[PDB]
């Protein structure tokens, strides 16, 4: 259970990281995004 | 504890999923979003 | 392990909360965002 939750949490951290990059790019207009 | 963390993680997965949909819609202009 | 996962999950909840605020601001044009 815990090891599977570690994996789910790691997947969430990657997804949140990607969302942060995308949202920052939208907010700041990076490269015209 | 673990069962409550499972629920928190599931809530995060739903919220991240919704954010991904919204951010993709913003990025791609889906339906004029 | 569990206590560390609680902390990671709490960090994710804060990050997702911030993303929701930013994405809602982008979607709704709040304050011209």
From C33, A27, A17, C20, select the one nearest B22 (Cα to Cα): C20
Category of A29 on φ-ψ map: left (φ > 0), alpha (ψ -120 to 50) or beta: left
As given in the structure block, the two tokens for residue C2 are 């569990």
Please report residues of B whose CB lies closer than 8 A to that of C25: none
Nearest residue, CB atoms, C16 vs list B16, B23, B26 = B16
CA distance A12 to B29: 25
Our CA-based measurement puts residue A28 at a distance from the nearest CA of chain B, in whole angstroms, of 13
Whole-Å CA distances, C22 to A18, B11, C16, C28, C33: 14, 19, 10, 10, 9
Give this entry's resolution in angstroms: 1.7
Q: By what method was this entry solved?
A: X-ray
> Which residues, at least 6 apart from B6, have a Cβ–Cβ distance to it below 8 Å?
A1, A5
A16 touches chain C (CB under 8 A): yes
Q: Which residue of B has its CA nearest to A2?
A: B2
From A12, A6, A3, select the one nearest C5 (Cα to Cα): A6
Cβ-contact B16, A23 below 8 angstroms: no
């Amino acid at each position: 259970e815990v090891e599977a939750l570690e994996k789910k949490v790691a997947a969430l951290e990657l997804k949140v990281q990607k969302l942060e990059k995308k949202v920052e790019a939208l907010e700041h207009g990076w490269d015209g995004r």
